[PDB]
Ligand binder design. Structure first.
Ligand SMILES: Cc1cnc(Nc2cc(F)c(C3CCN(C)CC3)c(F)c2)nc1Nc1ccc(F)c(NS(=O)(=O)C(C)(C)C)c1
Length: 289
């Protein structure tokens, strides 16, 4: 589909784990008429990561939604190595950086517009029995001032056809400050744990990515910055077990923070669905307008 001899590297957009995303121009005619695309590749083409990356490509290719980053194709060299994922390029970057830049022009109604778009994108994943796991403002991309998209699926897993959860323990850094408690203790990931993580995403939006108010900062100040390594996740477990939650962001209405706290239910079954979340957000957004 996309030949590597026509992918012109422009700049690197982001580097997480275990791959990176590059801004490239696919210009096969060699006349600056091609489009700028986003190319995701691996940093170490191991067989374990290559198998996960191929399943990630199939997941994204199976997704067609206004709030999901569009899949365009793949690219590979001689063989199955150097495999790359070709996606659409969204100009305004991640919602984490975009909100932090225009924080003086993005009111609460605009935050609820992005919130509904995230819920409708997550609910579409739930119909496919996909568990995103890694939902955060760093993963939500901005196409323009009126549309955001879920921009990465490197941790997304398909649920077993007979279970509603998915147990997985991946070696490496885990965003434990977005994870549901059952994901920290039992490595259990479900649609309900995505609801917990969405509540953290809702917390991020209303903090406007103030670095002192970040979920890791607030959680670490609650358990004490003196905690060390494994004792960090253990005190976070004990804190969440005792209804220790992130504070209400500055200027956040009471009803918006309730959505966060209700998503932050220790009882996995008592967390609301994304369709109910979209309803309550659209209901508040209409009452504001
Ligand atoms: C699939 C995709 C499509 N379009 C874009 N557009 C975009 C991304 C930018 F960053 C930026 C800038 C770059 C410079 N600085 C200052 C920030 C803003 C920009 F102008 C446009 N980006 C994508 N991917 C992507 C990229 C970079 C990440 F950091 C992440 N984050 S990530 O998913 O968690 C992962 C890397 C997988 C761990 C995803």
């Amino acid at each position: 589909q996309f030949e590597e001899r026509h992918l012109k590297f422009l700049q690197q957009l982001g580097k997480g784990n275990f791959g990176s995303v590059e801004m490239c121009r696919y210009d096969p005619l060699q006349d600056n008429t091609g489009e700028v695309v986003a190319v995701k590749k691996l940093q170490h083409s191991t067989e374990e990561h290559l198998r996960d990356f191929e399943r990630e490509i199939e997941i994204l290719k199976s997704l067609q939604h206004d709030n999901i980053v569009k899949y365009k194709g793949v690219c590979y060299s001689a063989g199955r190595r150097n495999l790359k994922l070709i996606m659409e390029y969204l100009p305004y970057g991640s919602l984490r950086d975009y909100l932090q830049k225009h924080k003086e022009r993005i009111d609460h109604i605009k935050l609820l517009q992005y919130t509904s778009q995230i819920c409708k994108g997550m609910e579409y994943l739930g119909t496919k029995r996909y568990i995103h796991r890694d939902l955060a403002t760093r993963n939500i991309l901005v196409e323009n001032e009126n549309r955001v998209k879920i921009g990465d699926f490197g941790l997304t897993k398909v649920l077993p056809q007979d279970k509603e959860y998915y147990k997985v323990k991946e070696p490496g850094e885990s965003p434990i400050f977005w994870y549901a408690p059952e994901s920290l203790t039992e490595s259990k990931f479900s649609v309900a744990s995505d609801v917990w993580s969405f509540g953290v995403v809702l917390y991020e939006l209303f903090t406007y990515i103030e670095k002192s108010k970040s979920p890791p900062a607030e959680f670490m100040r609650m358990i004490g910055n003196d905690k060390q390594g494994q004792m960090i996740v253990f005190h976070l477990i004990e804190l969440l077990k005792n209804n220790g939650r992130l504070p209400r962001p500055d200027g956040c209405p009471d009803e918006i923070y309730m959505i966060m706290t209700e998503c932050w239910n220790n009882n996995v079954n008592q967390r609301p669905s994304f369709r109910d979340l979209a309803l309550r957000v659209d209901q508040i957004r209409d009452n504001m307008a």
